Design an enzyme around this catalytic site. Structure first.
Site, PDB file in Angstrom:
ATOM      1  CG  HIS A 108      -1.743  -1.283   1.238  1.00 35.47           C
ATOM      2  ND1 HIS A 108      -2.748  -1.460   2.287  1.00 35.47           N
ATOM      3  CD2 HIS A 108      -2.235  -2.198   0.276  1.00 35.47           C
ATOM      4  CE1 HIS A 108      -3.425  -2.528   1.829  1.00 35.47           C
ATOM      5  NE2 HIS A 108      -3.022  -3.060   0.774  1.00 35.47           N
ATOM      6  CG  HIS A 160      -7.677  -3.091  -2.334  1.00 34.87           C
ATOM      7  ND1 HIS A 160      -7.040  -1.913  -1.345  1.00 34.87           N
ATOM      8  CD2 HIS A 160      -6.567  -4.049  -1.886  1.00 34.87           C
ATOM      9  CE1 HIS A 160      -6.052  -2.331  -0.976  1.00 34.87           C
ATOM     10  NE2 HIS A 160      -5.694  -3.593  -0.885  1.00 34.87           N
ATOM     11  CG  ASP A 172      -3.441  -5.138  -3.330  1.00 36.14           C
ATOM     12  OD1 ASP A 172      -3.048  -4.090  -2.430  1.00 36.14           O
ATOM     13  OD2 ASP A 172      -4.128  -6.112  -2.983  1.00 36.14           O
ATOM     14  CG  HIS A 174       0.471  -9.396  -2.702  1.00 31.72           C
ATOM     15  ND1 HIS A 174       0.548  -8.228  -3.079  1.00 31.72           N
ATOM     16  CD2 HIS A 174      -0.713  -9.760  -1.908  1.00 31.72           C
ATOM     17  CE1 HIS A 174      -0.504  -7.468  -2.580  1.00 31.72           C
ATOM     18  NE2 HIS A 174      -0.828  -8.369  -1.711  1.00 31.72           N
TER      19      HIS A 174
HETATM   20  C1  LIG Z   1      -7.417  -7.796  -0.544  1.00 29.45           C
HETATM   21  C2  LIG Z   1      -6.357  -8.684  -0.732  1.00 29.45           C
HETATM   22  O1  LIG Z   1      -5.665  -8.341  -1.936  1.00 29.45           O
HETATM   23  C3  LIG Z   1      -5.043  -8.513   0.420  1.00 29.45           C
HETATM   24  N1  LIG Z   1      -5.392  -8.689   1.735  1.00 29.45           N
HETATM   25  C4  LIG Z   1      -5.779 -10.036   2.380  1.00 29.45           C
HETATM   26  O2  LIG Z   1      -5.653 -11.085   1.590  1.00 29.45           O
HETATM   27  N2  LIG Z   1      -5.964  -9.977   3.618  1.00 29.45           N
HETATM   28  C5  LIG Z   1      -5.876  -8.595   4.359  1.00 29.45           C
HETATM   29  C6  LIG Z   1      -7.288  -8.695   5.261  1.00 29.45           C
HETATM   30  C7  LIG Z   1      -7.187  -9.992   6.157  1.00 29.45           C
HETATM   31  C8  LIG Z   1      -8.460  -9.808   7.422  1.00 29.45           C
HETATM   32  C9  LIG Z   1      -9.373  -8.779   7.404  1.00 29.45           C
HETATM   33  C10 LIG Z   1     -10.493  -8.745   8.023  1.00 29.45           C
HETATM   34  C11 LIG Z   1     -10.491  -9.985   8.924  1.00 29.45           C
HETATM   35  C12 LIG Z   1     -11.632  -9.702   9.850  1.00 29.45           C
HETATM   36  C13 LIG Z   1     -12.836  -9.709  10.186  1.00 29.45           C
HETATM   37  C14 LIG Z   1     -14.085  -9.306  10.806  1.00 29.45           C
HETATM   38  C15 LIG Z   1     -15.336 -10.411  10.469  1.00 29.45           C
HETATM   39  C16 LIG Z   1     -16.642 -10.123  10.651  1.00 29.45           C
HETATM   40  C17 LIG Z   1     -16.549  -9.553  11.696  1.00 29.45           C
HETATM   41  C18 LIG Z   1     -15.692  -8.741  12.315  1.00 29.45           C
HETATM   42  C19 LIG Z   1     -14.327  -8.770  11.939  1.00 29.45           C
HETATM   43  C20 LIG Z   1      -9.843 -10.996   9.051  1.00 29.45           C
HETATM   44  C21 LIG Z   1      -8.734 -10.907   8.168  1.00 29.45           C
HETATM   45  C22 LIG Z   1      -7.332 -11.186   5.496  1.00 29.45           C
HETATM   46  C23 LIG Z   1      -6.333 -11.273   4.312  1.00 29.45           C
HETATM   47  C24 LIG Z   1      -4.258  -7.419   0.354  1.00 29.45           C
HETATM   48  O3  LIG Z   1      -4.827  -6.048   0.198  1.00 29.45           O
HETATM   49  N3  LIG Z   1      -2.921  -7.532  -0.053  1.00 29.45           N
HETATM   50  O4  LIG Z   1      -2.548  -6.221   0.015  1.00 29.45           O
HETATM   51 ZN   LIG Z   2      -4.028  -4.532  -0.637  1.00 35.42          ZN
END
Ligand SMILES: C[C@@H](O)[C@H](NC(=O)N1CCC(c2ccc(C#Cc3ccccc3)cc2)CC1)C(=O)NO
Ligand SMILES: [Zn+2]
Ligand SMILES: [Zn+2]
Length: 267
Positions: free
Chosen positions: A73, A225, A229, A252
């Site tokens: 980011h 997004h 990335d 990635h």
């Molecule tokens: C986008 C992709 O390319 C990537 N992120 C990605 O794969 N992630 C980041 C977010 C992580 C995450 C986010 C939120 C929660 C949560 C929650 C929650 C759910 C229900 C109620 C309350 C909280 C758990 C793991 C999972 C993996 C990215 O932005 N790479 O740059």
């Molecule tokens: Zn990202």
């Protein structure tokens, strides 16, 4: 355009999405030819593909036993603003996620740009190239302007969506947040990741539901997004990039695979 640094030291702080720990950043001005690099515990970690140590759910960099998680980011924002010379000092193990988008970094850095005395030597895509991974695909071709298309095929209500960034439309991708699917969270937590993830920094989607009370910032926020990335991972070529890119379900790992093939080609 001209090589650029920051006018003064810029600070940012907050939780890291993967470690869940609180970390702090200090962006330092640097002279022409320095390049973009991170600094942690006396070690300089250049923002280049040779320093990539992890690509699953984030792009991470490491050098001489010092590691920094989630560089994508901040690097995307620096790539979009064409900041070419800075040191990102990291006090902690990860770049703060902030609201899940590049907005806070973008707004603070754009108001603090110092133009330098030399022109940018862009990484120019000279011929077509294609990288693949079981259905996932990324192609690049020559272009005087940076153009980036991402196409997703989501297994929920979103279905198929496509978005294209072109130079001058930086504001269209800098507010798009990181996202996650509810059925994938258990795996992410089990593999020691997403510890700082919440509805405050992530757009969380179900099969037919949006968990975030504020909803989506754009109907195609996830693909915007993913474009953001890829622009971050492309900066691992070591210079702002000129080329036309198309990513079908890329991540990635495939972004870094493309970057390494482009670098090898131009040796
Ligand atoms: C986008 C992709 O390319 C990537 N992120 C990605 O794969 N992630 C980041 C977010 C992580 C995450 C986010 C939120 C929660 C949560 C929650 C929650 C759910 C229900 C109620 C309350 C909280 C758990 C793991 C999972 C993996 C990215 O932005 N790479 O740059
Ligand atoms: Zn990202
Ligand atoms: Zn995984």
């Amino acid at each position: 355009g001209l090589e650029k640094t920051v006018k003064e030291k810029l600070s940012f702080e907050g939780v890291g999405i993967h470690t869940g720990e609180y970390s702090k950043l200090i962006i330092h001005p640097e002279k022409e030819g320095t390049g973009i690099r991170f600094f942690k515990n006396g070690v300089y970690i250049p923002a280049r593909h040779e320093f990539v140590v992890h690509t699953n759910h984030s792009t991470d960099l490491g050098f001489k036993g010092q590691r920094i998680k989630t560089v994508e980011h901040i690097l995307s924002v620096l790539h979009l603003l064409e900041i070419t010379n800075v040191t990102i000092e990291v006090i902690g193990n990860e770049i703060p996620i902030l609201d899940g988008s590049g907005w806070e970094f973008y707004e603070a850095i754009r108001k603090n740009i110092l133009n330098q005395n030399r022109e940018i030597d862009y990484f120019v895509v000279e011929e077509p190239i294609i990288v693949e991974d079981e259905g996932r695909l990324i192609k690049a071709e020559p272009s005087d302007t940076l153009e980036v298309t991402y196409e997703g095929e989501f297994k929920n209500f979103l279905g198929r969506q496509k978005f294209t960034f072109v130079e001058g439309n930086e504001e269209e991708i800098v507010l798009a947040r990181t996202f996650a699917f509810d059925w994938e969270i258990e795996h992410i937590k089990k593999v020691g990741l997403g510890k700082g993830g919440s509805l405050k920094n992530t757009l969380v989607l179900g099969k037919d539901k949006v968990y975030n009370p504020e909803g989506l910032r754009y109907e195609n926020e996830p693909v915007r997004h993913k474009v953001f990335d890829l622009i971050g991972d492309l900066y691992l070529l070591g210079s702002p990039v000129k080329g036309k890119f198309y990513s079908f379900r890329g991540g990635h790992s495939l972004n870094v695979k493309l970057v390494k093939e482009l670098a090898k080609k131009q040796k």
